[PDB]
Structure formats: structure tokens, C-alpha cells
Ligand binder design. Structure first.
Ligand SMILES: Nc1ncnc2c1ncn2[C@@H]1O[C@H](COP(=O)(O)OP(=O)(O)O)[C@@H](O)[C@H]1O
Ligand SMILES: Nc1ncnc2c1ncn2[C@@H]1O[C@H](COP(=O)(O)OP(=O)(O)O)[C@@H](O)[C@H]1O
Ligand SMILES: [Ca+2]
Ligand SMILES: [Ca+2]
Lengths: 375, 68, 68, 375, 187
């Protein structure tokens, strides 16, 4: 509040940014990650356009915005825009200076080494940050319950991560990185809607798909039995009068797209359903480690709020796997902020000093200081 | 009609220069393939020879101590 | 008029693939000279390393006899 | 050639198949072991797809092939495909019928008893093979030099075998079976490349890794001293312009993966380096047997062609072991075909009659006839 | 075209003369190789000013109007969209498939449609594709000369195929599976 530097809490993704004040429990400001141009010519004088529009400002008025996506899994097409995206967060809402308080960020597993240094360069050189750190998504969602033995699966808009982090981290391969989350779901629906004629073309209405999705759409329990149910017009035909003015009866369209999750064959890949990858992370570890893993499976990420996402797991996991222990998956109810809950902790830890980076530490060991010492 | 005859005079010139270049370019690529093959071959031997002398000097050092 | 365009286009196509081939061929030819020089250089070093480790083979042998 | 049945020579593994004509010295046809589907729909009519594609046919055009691996150490996910894989070898190239000549195969030590019978069933029942046999990998590489006292270490793509076969075979345990060869190396690199951003995802480009590997990649003599050498950009940065179109400077990536060989700790196991397993096979046998074992150590398998694989052995073996005899490892130059050289022999031996199996012999003692009598 | 002609005064309004534009187009109009260099060429009146006396009675010197409209093809920004040039969409269809599938795709690119007869449509592809894409294989685009009937050539085949029976629809087949019979079974 006043005494002691007091550090902030943040969690940037490739779709939605989570950031609030300091010493909080949950994000206070969650603005969308969008920045486009006025392909059109702004009125050009009815402001020197520039500002691609962002925050609640851009999301409020997409219409005349060519939403340009800067961060696509790993590669950032342009860093120049990111500079003015962070110049809005700490000031326009939080009304606090980073040249005063530390900073905490999230680490996207297996991200180019050059990126973690490019970011830090923006802080240390310009925003003068004597103290900060970048922790690993999943591991944060962990330290917030009451046990030191659980497997975590954290994901949202970036990429899927099957991290069996319970007793320790990193041994053979176990962990997995799969580019198939959030943004991928928003991109797949528009393609499949073309079969019925509906074709949300431009990237502006592309977002409307995501907005509509998180209100009615659900996951197919069993596509076979649900297909025969199509004969009826009660559980299928769903009402959603476009705020514009044209109803879209999303009946067989709701539980069609999610099927891709279990069937990556529909997106040109050999990756199997998420219940096979589960085995892929269990078969690698020791033999006397499984019985307790099934007894605890952490499922974090707001993506896992789709009706029919948890009940399916018990059907496929119990099939081709040992079946004499307690099969149990911990899917936190509000599992989207599970990372934010753990974030507020690291920022307050004192042992954190053993891990974080100090101003001088960045110059002594060079830019690689971060991931050259830690993991 | 006259321009139709002139335009052809320049075409044959570029075709020959392209073919003549392609002929040597392919030869150079083939030669490079042979040279690079021996390059890494000699490099492997050079590394091996370097490994030998290192072990020799180490053993010789021991022989000298035992001799004294 | 159309025939002229067809041939005129071929000229642009022939000229394009000619300057592109010759440009890379010249670059390749120059590169070969550099690689060839490196081959001769490395080969020379390998020869010096080979004759050296051989000198140690006869040196470590005579020392083993004196030690015995 | 004409007179006398004349037997063929073969050596099937879990990655590369070795087979040629009869009475030869080396394999004449070495096609890759790959068989996938057209996840895509073949043109479906631009041939009734089927043929998962195989041989130089599949390897030539991976692109649209979901390479499905049938044989994974021990378990064969499906036998149906293997039937049409062998229907190509003897005929399409060799142009000779197995219903005329005997057959020789290799035995993967410690393979399920049910497998050796399932295979023979395909020959005796359908391909009518009155005479055949399945010999043991390592032992073949032996009988081809000039002594009856040497220890052999044979491996390739299947699994590692430390077989001290010199005077005899099988006594306490000595021999070892380790699932860590070929395919394991191809699978580990892609995981480690993700640290730099490079992520060869699908199983098609997975093979490209193996192809690129066997041209420049080498083994670290001492990772400690080679790490400090990274400061220089001469011995590290290696040139290999992707046949597609993107250079990959494999500098510290070449001698990083092979380190796993000596450090199985990086693949979730307690197994020690290959120089400890050497002791594990020597300490078991008698006391007056060692002095001559060190004087002769056979190292077979094309895997042992990586620059920096033999010179390391002299460093680690001489460390924690008796040091008053002649430490000497026989690493045949072309040690990949060492099994094939020995194979051509067994097929021509007459004493072989004392070992091989005759048509009627399979029915009298049942299917177990093979490994119920021999070893 | 009619929209852009309004800058010079010419305004073919009704939908009847709208067709005349299409008729005139397929006789002289061509595509800009590089709009930058061709703009400076406007100073000259030889390669620009083209003659086409209206069958009605009024010449229209289509000079900078010929290679102006086609530019929209490569620049969909001029028609209110985020779609990139046809050489980006090419990447969009290549980057999705497997990795070991590309080297042979560049070696063969079929370009069908009579629309691809505009002078300066094929030579541009080699300029933009070789730019932002892998460059160690054989870049090669098959643009059939008369590529408008390429569909008709293939059509005469399907109608004569016998395997076609495995695909086509029979009278009774339409009643058994209802109207959806077609795209409910095939693709
Ligand atoms: N109530 C909800 N039900 C289902 N999905 C939701 C809900 N609220 C948000 N989402 C979805 O969660 C995703 C954003 O989750 P988030 O954790 O912020 O992702 P990331 O951090 O990967 O950007 C979006 O796909 C969004 O549609
Ligand atoms: N010249 C070479 N140098 C190094 N490794 C090689 C070479 N040629 C082949 N290999 C490797 O040898 C392995 C195949 O050897 P092979 O004896 O056929 O194995 P297996 O019988 O276990 O299938 C592959 O890992 C391949 O990359
Ligand atoms: Ca995420
Ligand atoms: Ca083997």
C-alpha cells in the first residue's frame, strides 16, 4: 500500500492480458490483446489516427479496425507495438510507476531464448526495473492447495501444456507443448460454418465468434449418439439473435468444433486426443508413480469451462489405462485465475530472492542471466 | 513486322548465356560436393590426430616420471 | 502484335534466368576458390598432425624400452 | 545361383531392414521401415490409396504420409501391415520366391515368446518355408575375425545389447538390454531443439532429423571444455541449408544430444553411462577372465560412427577399473554390416542342420519348437 | 473498374454498359509488373495511351487505367479487406501441411481459369513467391495456356468414367436417404 516497495502482479498471454494492482488476489484489469490500423484513413485529421486502437477502446469499436495480431505462438511480428501496450497498463488504470515497484511475468515453456532477453531489455534499459522475474505458468497454479504430489494441465489461448509437475520438474520428456488452444478454436469455427453458408470473413467478426462461443456452445459427449438426436429440434436449435440482426441457430455447430480437441486429425496432425497425451506423460515416469497421479489431475485454464469437458475424461482415461486405483481429476471451478492466485504468492515470497534477478545481476552475467542460471 | 524479327535476335543471346552458365554452375556444384566430402574427411582425421598426440604426451609424461 | 508479345515476354524470361544464373554461378565460382584454398590449408595441417603423432609413436616406444 | 536350393540372407530391425540376394557378402536392398496412411483422402480415386506408402516409394514422398510406426521395442501394434512389407522384399527386387529357398532372420534378445511363433506361422502356413532359422544379432558379428575370446556390444535402432560373448553364452546375468538406440536418438533431438524455438512437430520431419544427424552431428569429448569454446564461432556454427529453405546453425546442438548416451539421467532412468555397464558385465564373470576382455572389446552397429564415440571409451574405462592389462576396444570400421557378414555364414553352414528347423519339426513339438529347444 | 474511371470523369452507370467494360477489358488491359516504375513511365505517351475507338463513337485512351485495376488483385486493401496478395495465400496453404511436402509443391503449381490470361499475371508470381519463402527447391508454376477449359476437359472424363458409378446418384438413391443424399455421403 505505502511502506515497502510493494510488487505488482501480471500474467500476459497471446490473447488476454491479466494484470491488477499490488498484493491482490485476482486480476483487476483484463483488457483484450488487439492492435490494428485504420486501413480506411481515420478521418486522418479527426485524430492522427495512429493508436491501432487498444484496450476497451478498440474492443468497443472494432468496425473500422484492421485488428493486426502481433504475438503468434513464439514469433512476435513486431515489438514496437508491445511497447505502447505496456505503457497503458501500469499508468492509465493502475496509476502506479514500474520505476518504483518490482514486476512479475509468466513464461511460455520452450520460448526462443532471444525473446526472454528482448523483453527484459525494455524494462532494465528504459523502464528501469531493478527487480523482476518470469515464472512458469503451470507451476504457479500448483502452489495453492494442500499437497506436493499432483499433475497439472495448464492452457488458455497460447498453447496446450501437459505438465506432470508434482514432486519435481524436468526429467525425460513427459511434458508436452501443443499449439492448439483458444485462438485455434476461434479460427476453426469460421471454416466449418462455411458448410452452411455462414462465412465470418474479416478478423473483426472473427472475434465475435469467440464472444458468442462462451455463452452456449458445448462439447459433444458422444458425437455418434448426438448425431441421431439431430432429428429433434429442441436440444439442437439454439437461439442467439445477432446483436446486429440475424439469428444463427447453432445446433449441430456447437458440439462439432470441440470434437477437434479429441480428434486433432481434423487439423492436419498426428497428435492424439488429450487422453492419449495423458498416457504419454505417465508411461515415461517410474512405475510406482502412477497410482497417485490418477488420484490427482489438475486441470487449469478457463478453456476447460465448456459444458462436457470433464465428464469425457473419465470415459477415455479409464479405457486404455491401469484400472485399480482412484481415477480422479482436479478441475478447479474457476481455474482460469489459478495462475494469478499463484502469481500473487511468488511476488510476496522472500525465498523469491534466491530466484529473482537484481539490476546488477543482469550486467554481470550478460543478457542470458535469466535462463542461463534458472530453469 | 520488322520488330518481330529484331526481338528474336536478342532472345537467342540470353538463352545461350543461361545454358553456358548452367553448364559450369553444375560442374562447380559437383566439384564442391567432392571437395566438401574430403574437407570433413580431413577434418575428422585432423581431430583424430590431435586426440592421439594428446594421449601420447600424457603417457610419455608418465613414462618420464617412472624413468626418473 | 500478339506474336511479338509472346516472344518479347520470352526475352524478359530468358534475360531474367540468365542474369540470375550467371550471378549465382559467379558467386559459386568465387566460393569454390575459397573452399579449395581451405581444403589445401586443412590438408596441410592434417599432414603436419599426422607426421607429428607418428613421431610420438616412435618416441613413446623407445622410452618404453629405456623404462623397461 | 541355380543348383542347390540356395538360401537368402536377411536382418530385420525396428528401423532399417537389411536384405539382399543369396550367397552375398553385404545387403543389396536396404529399404526404410515406414508405413503410414493418407490422413488426407489420397485423391481417393487417384488410386484406392491403401499402401500407407513404403520402400523408396514412401521415403521419397513423405509429405502426405502419416508415418505409422508398427514395431515399437517388443510390441507390434499391428501385424497385418508386416505381411505386405515382406511381400515386397522377396519379389519386387530380389525376384525370387521364398517357396523355394530357405530363410534367415535375426533374434532380438528377450523378445516375447509369442512373437517368435507368430512370425514363423506366417512362413510355414502361408509362405511354405520347410527350412529357416532366427539367429542372435551379436553372436553373428562375432564369428568373423580370428579368435574365440572377445566381448561384443551390438546395437542400432532397436535396443542396446552388452553381450560378453567370447568363450560361451549365458551364465548369470552379464548381458544387458537397454531401450536406448537409434529411434531414441531421433526422438530426443526434437525435444531439445524446442529451447531455441525450432520444433519439428509431425513424424515426417522427425525423420529429417535422423537424415541431417548422420552428416555433421558429433559426440562431445568433454562437455565442460566444449562449453567455453562456444564463445568462438568457427568449430560451433555448422552450415546446413535446409533442402527446403532455412539454415539451421547446429553448433551446440550437435554435441548436446549424444551426451544423453553417457548420461541416461536426462531420459528418466537410473542406468549409468555405457562405461559403467561395461563393468556391470565384467564384475559378474570370473576373476581370471578380465585381463583378456579388456584386450578385446567388439563394438558393432552403425550408431558407433559418430565422431567422438571411441576415443571417449578409453577415458572412462581406464578410470574406475583395473589398470595393468592391455585396454583395447575393437570397433570395426564398417561395423553396421558385421551382423550381415556373419549372417551369410550361418546360411551356408552345414552344422546349421543341427540348429535349424525343418517343416515337420514345427508340427511335432508344436509352435514352441524354436525357443523351447534352442537358446 | 467503373468506380475508378470516375476519377477521370468517365462513369459507365447502368448495368448494361457495365458489361461493355468486361468486353473491352479482355482485349488490351494488362497487369502492372511494378506500379512504381510504371508510374514514372507515364511521362511518355507510347506504352500508355492505348487506342480503342468506342463502337459507339468516343475514344477512351486507357493508359494508366489498364494496369491500375489489376493492382487490386495483389492489394485487396483497395476493396476493404485484410486479405493479402495471392502470393501470401499461397504460403497460407503451404505452411499448414507437413514439412516434407513443400519442396515438391513449388515444383508444381496449377493455375486454371481464363482470368489468368491477363498479360503480366504469371511473371509476377515468380517475383513474390521467391521472396518470403524457402528458396532451395525448383520454383515452378504450371499455368496451362488455355486454362479456362481445364475444368471442361476433366468434366468430359467423369461423365465417361465407370468408377463414376461408385460416386454418382441414382433415381432411387435420392428417395432412400432423402434430399441430403448428395453431400451427406460424398464430399
Ligand atoms: N465463462 C467462460 N466459459 C468458457 N470459456 C470461457 C469463459 N470465459 C472465458 N472463456 C474463454 O477462455 C479463453 C481465455 O482464457 P485465458 O485463461 O484468459 O487464456 P490465455 O491466458 O491463454 O489468453 C477464451 O477462449 C475465452 O473464450
Ligand atoms: N554414416 C553414418 N554415420 C553415423 N550414423 C550412421 C551412418 N549411416 C547410418 N547411421 C545411423 O545408423 C542407424 C541405423 O543403423 P542400423 O545398423 O541399420 O540400425 P538397426 O539395425 O538398429 O535398425 C541410424 O541411426 C542411422 O542414422
Ligand atoms: Ca496459456
Ligand atoms: Ca539392433
Amino acid at each position: 500500500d505505502e511502506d515497502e516497495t510493494t510488487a505488482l502482479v501480471c500474467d500476459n498471454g497471446s490473447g488476454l492480458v491479466k494484470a491488477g494492482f499490488a498484493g491482490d488476489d485476482a486480476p483487476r484489469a483484463v483488457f483484450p490483446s488487439i492492435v490494428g490500423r485504420p486501413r480506411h484513413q481515420g478521418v486522418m485529421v479527426g485524430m492522427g489516427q495512429k493508436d491501432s486502437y487498444v484496450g476497451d477502446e478498440a474492443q468497443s469499436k472494432r468496425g473500422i479496425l484492421t485488428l493486426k495480431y502481433p504475438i503468434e505462438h513464439g514469433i512476435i511480428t513486431n515489438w514496437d507495438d508491445m511497447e505502447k501496450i505496456w505503457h497503458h497498463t501500469f499508468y492509465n488504470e493502475l496509476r502506479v510507476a514500474p520505476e518504483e515497484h518490482p514486476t512479475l511475468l509468466t513464461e511460455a515453456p520452450l520460448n526462443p531464448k532471444a525473446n526472454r532477453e528482448k523483453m527484459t531489455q525494455i524494462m532494465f534499459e528504459t523502464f528501469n526495473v531493478p527487480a523482476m522475474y518470469v515464472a512458469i505458468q503451470a507451476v504457479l497454479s500448483l502452489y495453492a492447495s494442500g499437497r506436493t504430489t499432483g499433475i497439472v494441465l495448464d492452457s488458455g489461448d497460447g498453447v496446450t501444456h501437459n505438465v506432470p509437475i508434482y514432486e519435481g520438474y524436468a526429467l525425460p520428456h513427459a511434458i508436452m507443448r501443443l499449439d492448439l488452444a483458444g485462438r485455434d478454436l476461434t479460427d476453426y469455427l469460421m471454416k466449418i460454418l462455411t458448410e452452411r453458408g455462414y462465412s465470418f470473413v474479416t478478423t473483426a467478426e472473427r472475434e465475435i465468434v469467440r464472444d458468442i462461443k462462451e455463452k452456449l456452445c458445448y462439447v459433444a459427449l458422444d458425437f455418434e449418439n448426438e448425431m441421431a438426436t439431430a432429428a429433434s429440434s429442441s436440444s439442437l436449435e439454439k437461439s442467439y439473435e445477432l446483436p446486429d440482426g440475424q439469428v444463427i441457430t447453432i445446433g449441430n455447430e456447437r458440439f462439432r468444433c470441440p470434437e477437434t480437441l479429441f480428434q486433432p486429425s481434423f487439423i492436419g496432425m498426428e497428435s492424439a486426443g488429450i487422453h492419449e497425451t495423458t498416457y504419454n506423460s505417465i508411461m515415461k515416469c517410474d512405475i510406482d508413480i502412477r497410482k497417485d497421479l490418477y488420484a490427482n489431475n489438475v486441470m487449469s485454464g478457463g478453456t476447460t469451462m465448456y459444458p462436457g469437458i470433464a465428464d469425457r475424461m473419465q470415459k477415455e482415461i479409464t479405457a486404455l489405462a491401469p484400472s485399480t486405483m482412484k481415477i480422479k481429476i482436479i478441475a478447479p471451478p474457476e481455474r482460469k485465475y489459478s495462475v494469478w492466485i499463484g502469481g500473487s504468492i511468488l511476488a510476496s515470497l522472500s525465498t523469491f530472492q534466491q530466484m529473482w534477478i537484481t539490476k546488477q545481476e543482469y550486467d554481470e552475467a550478460g543478457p542470458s542471466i535469466v535462463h542461463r542460471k534458472c530453469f | 513486322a520488322r520488330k518481330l524479327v529484331i526481338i528474336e535476335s536478342d532472345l537467342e543471346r540470353a538463352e545461350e548465356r543461361a545454358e553456358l552458365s548452367e553448364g559450369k554452375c553444375a560442374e562447380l556444384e559437383e566439384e564442391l560436393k567432392t571437395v566438401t566430402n574430403n574437407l570433413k574427411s580431413l577434418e575428422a582425421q585432423a581431430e583424430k590426430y590431435s586426440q592421439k598426440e594428446d594421449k601420447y604426451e600424457e603417457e610419455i609424461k608418465v613414462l618420464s616420471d617412472k624413468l626418473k
